[PDB]
Amino acid sequence: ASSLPQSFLLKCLEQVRKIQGDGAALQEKLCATYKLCHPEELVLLGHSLGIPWAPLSSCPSQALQLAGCLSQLHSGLFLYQGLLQALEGISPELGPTLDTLQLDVADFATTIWQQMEELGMAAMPAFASAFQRRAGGVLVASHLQSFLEVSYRVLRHLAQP
Template sequence: MEAVLAASKPLDQRASCLHPSPSTKEPPAIRTPAPRPRSHQPPAPQPLSQACPRSLMKLTVSLPVLLCWSTLWWLREATAAQAPVPALPHRFLLQCLEQVRKIQAQSWELQEKLCASYQLCHPEELVLLGHSLGIPRARPSSCSNKALQLTSCLGPLHRGLFLYQGLLQALAGITPELEPTVDLLQLDVADFATNVWRQMEDMGVAPSMQPAPGPMPTFTSAFQRRAGGVLVASSLQTFLEQASRLLRGLTQP
């Protein structure tokens, strides 16, 4: 009997090793995966339609167009600034000088007749009377042959001639013997003004309308009319002398 128990004991121990009891059994350990280190890569760029508003997209598209237009405008201005300035025709300048000499001769004739017949020989003595009568004066502006500004050169010349044409009209009825001289002088001044205006039109620098006549003096006596004739003729002489110097300078190369 003891021999049977001794022989069965190792079998029980072997059975216990193969089939352990529930109280002594341990659960298997659960291994959690180690966390991976985070990579420091930048986020992927978003599309342009999501990152920018529509107004910014329109500005981005139109910016090359604006740059193109600004470049074309700058080139056009630079070309216009470097373009050669048109010169006055030589024939026109010679014709103007001839008209100046003719009008100057008639103006001197009017002054000499007023001096011989009415002793009105010194226009400087009548300056105060001219101011009180409101007799205007005209002066041509300066212009050079190197940088000829046609509008600033021919415009004042035409306006001055137009002014003296009106002043000579105001002298109508000065005296019976002087009236033909004044009428012829007025016609020649008007012809000179017309010549200048046509040249301005040919060169494309004429204003859209001719100048309107300004206020003219009113002579209430024969003495005022004769004194006005002296002042107008003297002022016209000074104006033509300045215009002649300018025109002669333009004829030189």
């Protein structure tokens, strides 16, 4: 007995896997093109640049009642959709890769929104230079990955009650 259709949770899980590969494709590009391979190194730039992170505190909770978790998931995805747009394509060589990733992320947000609607459940940083865009690109990709790795669990849990 769940407030979410099992197919919705499955399509969501399929979108996480898809976005996880997009971001992986992006993070491969940035390390092959700009030898920017370890986000760890860019840790402080997180504050310097103002990279907003995304919580899922409402997710290690809920069950038959879960609009809170659905609202965090959406807003979290909604945020990374914004940050990726802020990177203004990073560069011509990364433009297509980053573009793929932002469409996917945007539609995943839309999709979680519209489902909440159906079920009745009802700014951006600057990155002012090549390097800042490249570094911001590496940090947002990795914050997206952590967010998604946590979401995967939240969802697997929801899909297997």
